[PDB]
Every structure is written in structure tokens, then in C-alpha cells.
Amino acid sequence: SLKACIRCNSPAKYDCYLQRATCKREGCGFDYCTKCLCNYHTTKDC
Numbered sequence: 001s002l003k004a005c006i007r008c009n010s011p012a013k014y015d016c017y018l019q020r021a022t023c024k025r026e027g028c029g030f031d032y033c034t035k036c037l038c039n040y041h042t043t044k045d046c
């Protein structure tokens, strides 16, 4: 059920709650929307 990163397809914690994924890699570890596989809506922007 994990989300495959758009880089090396790593096991990212997929959260259907907000349709977001968090790469579980020490080289990535970033938040992003699993819908558009792009930047996740944050204090900054999407």
C-alpha cells in the first residue's frame, strides 16, 4: 500500500486521508501529494 517515490520508487508512507506520501528514504524524506506526485500543499504553496 506504500507509495513509490517518483525518484527510485521507494516505500513512502501513503496517507489516503490527505492523499499524501512521505518517502521513507534518508536520501529523500519529503512530503508530496500522491495525486499529482508533486509538492504537497504547505505553508508555502503547492
Ligand SMILES: [Zn+2]
Pocket (backbone or CB within 6 Å): 005, 006, 007, 008, 009, 010, 023, 025, 027, 028
Ligand atoms: Zn526516493
Ligand SMILES: [Zn+2]
Pocket (backbone or CB within 6 Å): 033, 035, 036, 038, 039, 040, 041, 046
Ligand atoms: Zn497537490
